[PDB]
């Protein structure tokens, strides 16, 4: 069956870049963050979330983000509701890709704990806090309050490295990052 390789990393460490690169190269990829957004488009999921978090008043992604960064209890309720639905989608991803020897899944931010020990192998992408902050500022979503809350929630890079089978440095130029991804592919292929 398909070996599932999880990709984890702090915010702005380059997870998206690596998953995009692998997809461009034809590898099977599961983008958990985009899957969560698809879950939020499901009217039954919306309805259940509104029953669980009636303080939202309406199903609106911006209001959800605001609430879960402001409120740890709400964030926990939402994560406990979404995580099993996300696992169902990951199971389907593995099933549809059974003739592929391996495939890759982005571990979404703040779900790192929930996904502990889920994957066959884990790759962590790391880089300096200075580079992560620079990257965060260059993105259109930048919000210092949210960035600081993420910096307090998320597991440290050292902890992520400790739980990883492979650790890749994204605090390098993009073309050297791509070379490291190609090295990762070769290492996984020899595990087979």
Curated annotation (Swiss-Prot):
Its EC number is 2.7.1.24. InterPro entries: Depp_CoAkinase, P-loop_NTPase. The keyword ATP-binding applies. Its main location: cytoplasm. This is Dephospho-CoA kinase. Disulfide bonds: none annotated. Catalyzes the phosphorylation of the 3'-hydroxyl group of dephosphocoenzyme A to form coenzyme A. The keyword Cytoplasm applies. It catalyses: 3'-dephospho-CoA + ATP = ADP + CoA + H(+). Pathway: Cofactor biosynthesis; coenzyme A biosynthesis; CoA from (R)-pantothenate: step 5/5. It is an enzyme of class 2 (transferase). Residues 4-192 form the DPCK domain. It comes from the Bacteria. One of its GO terms (cellular component) is cytoplasm. It is found in: Cytoplasm. GO terms for molecular function: ATP binding; dephospho-CoA kinase activity. GO terms for biological process: coenzyme A biosynthetic process. It comes from Rickettsia felis (strain ATCC VR-1525 / URRWXCal2). Belongs to the CoaE family. Keywords: ATP-binding, Coenzyme A biosynthesis, Cytoplasm, Kinase, Nucleotide-binding, Transferase. ATP binds at residues 12-17.
